[PDB]
Amino acid sequence: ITGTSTVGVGRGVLGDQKNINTTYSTYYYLQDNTRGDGIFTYDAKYRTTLPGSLWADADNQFFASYDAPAVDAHYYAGVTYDYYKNVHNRLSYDGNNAAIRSSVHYSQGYNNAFWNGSEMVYGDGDGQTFIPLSGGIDVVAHELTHAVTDYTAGLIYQNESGAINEAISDIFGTLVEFYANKNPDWEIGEDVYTPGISGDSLRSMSDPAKYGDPDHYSKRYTGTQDNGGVHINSGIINKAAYLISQGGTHYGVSVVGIGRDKLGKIFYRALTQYLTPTSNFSQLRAAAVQSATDLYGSTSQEVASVKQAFDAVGVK
Numbered sequence: 001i002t003g004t005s006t007v008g009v010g011r012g013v014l015g016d017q018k019n020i021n022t023t024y025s026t027y028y029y030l031q032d033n034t035r036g037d038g039i040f041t042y043d044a045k046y047r048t049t050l051p052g053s054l055w056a057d058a059d060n061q062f063f064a065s066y067d068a069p070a071v072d073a074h075y076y077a078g079v080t081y082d083y084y085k086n087v088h089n090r091l092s093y094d095g096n097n098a099a100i101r102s103s104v105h106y107s108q109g110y111n112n113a114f115w116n117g118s119e120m121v122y123g124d125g126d127g128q129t130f131i132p133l134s135g136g137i138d139v140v141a142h143e144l145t146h147a148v149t150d151y152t153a154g155l156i157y158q159n160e161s162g163a164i165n166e167a168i169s170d171i172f173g174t175l176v177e178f179y180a181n182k183n184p185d186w187e188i189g190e191d192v193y194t195p196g197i198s199g200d201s202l203r204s205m206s207d208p209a210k211y212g213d214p215d216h217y218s219k220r221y222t223g224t225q226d227n228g229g230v231h232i233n234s235g236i237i238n239k240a241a242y243l244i245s246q247g248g249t250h251y252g253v254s255v256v257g258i259g260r261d262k263l264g265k266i267f268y269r270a271l272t273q274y275l276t277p278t279s280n281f282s283q284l285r286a287a288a289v290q291s292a293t294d295l296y297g298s299t300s301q302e303v304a305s306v307k308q309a310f311d312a313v314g315v316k
């Protein structure tokens, strides 16, 4: 829409109050003109037709419970755009400031959220397994990172390349969660998953086996479910990324951590310059080693730690 840029206030899924960038033109719209070609948030009104209607509000205050998932989708897409711009110098997901669109209230009781190739889509959850998925900043950044991947490496969504695709989304969703300093951790989706149970999450990067995902290449899923285990076998790479950052000893192999910042620089470089659509885990290890070599030198501690981490999860 064409209008005047302004700032409104509302409450997110978790009850926290935040300011959001909106546009005024008769109604106040969830349209943020301050980032790239804009961030637009739509109401899918419990249907599956997309994108639905651009979110319009009469007084620029978003405190209704129906408003909450829109508030956070809009606000966390703005924080993810900021992270990629300020930390990695990338303007939006295509690198040329493409507009970011998200629809909330997709379908009824839908327990998922996803990047469909053109925009973000979020379910409200059934209220037991999940609450509205846009309340999780790691979920939002995980999904928006698939858009980055689609425009750069282009990893296909199956077998080892899909598991790399998923792990890259978990890694950067986690780094965004640390950049916003939103009670940060190495788990995924703990703010929106099972409201009635405290302490769990969908997946864990520090200990993937806690929820049953493999933490070593010899434990990888080899069947056909979940497009060859994209959400299961991503635990092997998540554990390697956690070790590179934080250090530790895993199956008797010791890794000195080099921190989150270098973790992000190495993986971002591997993703945008060396990964291809059909890269496998062994090619990710080579890409990460080469990236670390470009940035820190072939005899750095950083290169050494990337090697030990992949060795610890059995990836040669």
Ligand SMILES: [Ca+2]
Pocket (backbone or CB within 6 Å): 057, 058, 059, 060, 061, 062, 063
């Ligand atoms: Ca209102």
Ligand SMILES: [Ca+2]
Pocket (backbone or CB within 6 Å): 177, 182, 183, 184, 185, 190, 191
């Ligand atoms: Ca957290």
Ligand SMILES: [Ca+2]
Pocket (backbone or CB within 6 Å): 138, 174, 177, 184, 185, 186, 187, 188, 189, 190
């Ligand atoms: Ca998390």
Ligand SMILES: [Ca+2]
Pocket (backbone or CB within 6 Å): 190, 193, 194, 195, 196, 197, 198, 199, 200, 201
């Ligand atoms: Ca829970």
Ligand SMILES: [Zn+2]
Pocket (backbone or CB within 6 Å): 142, 143, 146, 165, 166, 169
């Ligand atoms: Zn994903």
